[PDB]
Design a protein around this ligand. Structure first.
Ligand code: NA
Length: 550
């Protein structure tokens, strides 16, 4: 079911099998981290277009013992053979996203598996053999697919029809429909090999060199030395405060936390509870806020190891006011340029503001969350950049490679320019909300740049409007990053949309799904966990109740 309640454990994932697997891990004494790993593998199996060991993600973990919140950063790095103008042709103009998404240089160094390694060596309590076996037997013996997978295959037949993925997903040229069984023998082989040799086989073994060869064959410049040079990082979350709660989220190289918190700070003083959850005022103010935030994102966000992001000025109260001057109910801001936070901050941008064309299909990830009986809290957002990533299947291994490096700017000079060993700017937002410095909520969503809007709104809907968790998730969302791009979910009143367009907005004719939030609420005063999965997909929440003497 989409909503469940537990007392000793709780799991919320995008695929039911992964949910029941993680729940099983919790059931026989495992913790939230073990479950997180098992769920990662199960998601690799059942939803290979969203997450994988050929991709990367951000894993937020709240430790039950040390009471510390840390982040396993497994973002992909560019090879040192990667160049700033590698997204430009010989004529100095931007290669279309359709070709960029599938090319060799779009592939970054996969970091997921090493992230799982670090997580297992820090908080792991069960043998990873046990954690990977169910996924192995899920790829070996097959499984009946869901509607999301089938629709994804049918919508991306063309990308899959040029790689080693056809003979698996397009048997005779026909995509596997809902109910069809998906068998992945080669994937099972890779999982078994990893079960044998560990991460060694991936980063210093046959799998690595194979990935290298197929990448170079697709025009890439990645070497096995690039793989063997890779290490995950550990990040301290970015902190904000909203209506008495402390919010912990993802800092650079992700843009999620900073500007989600910025949107919160910007819209807080308008008190949206004053208006109706489907009124003109709320939607309008949301849009006006998002424009400013994304405007800043397009100019000030990038890998902190390479460029300086002005966090301190992006969240400064006086700066927030200065930007709030541009937000009003009586008019619409038609000149949406990035603000100047550097006033309120020591330092100077070591780059320039470089305009980018908006040729970006927006990609989808997967987010999941786990909670155990020891106060450990896991909120993991993992991704290959887009559905099936590049589409490139590692030959003989049945593994999809990401196109994460497209998250870089096509035109160099900016903070998010292509640099070697540099991590591309992400929009993912794994987030944990605390009260009295103790975890009470988990928020996270997939869908590239829209994620920030999905989380924000959700959080808003939960605290400003005080709605229930499922109501906060299911409450229709909107998205806009410019005066040209607008999206709205099914649920917005037609007259309100029409008036919004009369005010200068550009909402389209038909609605689309925005994000997919899985969340876990921690009710300590009732000693239970509540799990909710978004209806946008076939997500699932499963609770765990363990008897004493067990
Ligand atoms: Na992304």
């Amino acid at each position: 079911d989409k909503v469940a309640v537990g007392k000793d454990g709780m799991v919320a994932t995008a695929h039911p099998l992964a949910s029941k697997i993680g729940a099983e891990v919790l059931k026989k004494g495992g913790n939230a981290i073990d479950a997180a790993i098992a769920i990662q593998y199960a998601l690799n199996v059942t939803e290979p277009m969203m997450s994988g060991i050929g991709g990367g993600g951000f894993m937020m973990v709240y430790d039950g013992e040390t009471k510390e919140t840390s982040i396993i950063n497994s973002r992909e790095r560019a090879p040192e053979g990667a160049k700033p103008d590698m997204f430009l042709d010989e004529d100095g103009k931007v290669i279309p996203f359709s070709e960029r998404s599938r090319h060799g240089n779009a592939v970054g160094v996969p970091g997921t598996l090493k992230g799982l390694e670090a997580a297992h060596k820090k908080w792991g309590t069960k043998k990873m053999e046990d954690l990977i076996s169910p996924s192995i037997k899920l790829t070996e013996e097959g499984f009946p697919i869901d509607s999301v997978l089938a629709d994804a295959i049918k919508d991306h037949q063309d990308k899959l029809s040029k790689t080693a993925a056809k003979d698996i997903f397009l048997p005779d040229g026909e995509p596997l429909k809902e109910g069809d069984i998906l068998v992945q023998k080669d994937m099972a082989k890779t999982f078994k090999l990893i079960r044998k040799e560990g991460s060694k086989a991936f980063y210093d073994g046959e799998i690595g060199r194979a990935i290298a060869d197929v990448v170079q064959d697709f025009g890439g410049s990645m070497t096995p030395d690039d793989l063997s040079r890779y290490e995950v990082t550990t990040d301290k979350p970015i902190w904000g405060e909203y209506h008495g709660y402390d919010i912990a989220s993802m800092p650079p190289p992700s843009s999620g936390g900073v500007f989600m918190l910025q949107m919160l700070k910007l819209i807080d003083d308008f008190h949206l509870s004053q208006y109706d959850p489907k009124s003109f005022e709320k939607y309008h103010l949301l849009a006006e806020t998002m424009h400013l935030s994304y405007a800043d994102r397009a100019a000030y966000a990038g890998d902190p190891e390479f460029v300086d992001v002005p966090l301190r000025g992006l969240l400064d109260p006086d700066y927030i006011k200065e930007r709030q001057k541009l937000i009003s109910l009586d008019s619409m801001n038609r000149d949406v340029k990035e603000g100047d936070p550097w006033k309120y901050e020591e330092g100077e941008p070591n780059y320039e503001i470089v305009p980018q064309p908006e040729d970006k299909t927006i990609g989808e990830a997967t987010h999941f969350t786990v909670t155990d009986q020891w106060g450990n809290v896991v909120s993991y957002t993992t991704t290959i950049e887009q559905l099936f990533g590049t589409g490139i299947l590692v030959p003989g291994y049945g593994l999809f490679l990401n196109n994460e490096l497209t998250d870089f700017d096509a035109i160099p000079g900016g903070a998010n320019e292509v640099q070697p060993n540099k991590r591309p700017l992400s929009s993912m937002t794994p987030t944990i909300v605390f009260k009295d410095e103790k975890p009470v909520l988990t928020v996270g969503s997939p869908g590239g740049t829209t994620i920030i809007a999905s989380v924000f709104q959700t959080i808003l809907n939960y605290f400003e409007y005080g709605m229930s968790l499922q109501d906060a998730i299911e409450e229709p969302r909107i998205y806009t990053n410019s005066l040209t791009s607008y999206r709205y979910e099914s649920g917005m009143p037609e007259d309100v949309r029409r008036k919004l367009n009369d005010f200068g907005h550009k909402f389209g004719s038909n609605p689309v799904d925005i994000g997919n939030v899985q969340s876990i609420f921690i009710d300590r005063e009732n000693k239970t966990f509540m799990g909710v999965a978004d209806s946008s997909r076939n997500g699932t929440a499963v609770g765990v109740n363990i008897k004493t003497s067990a």
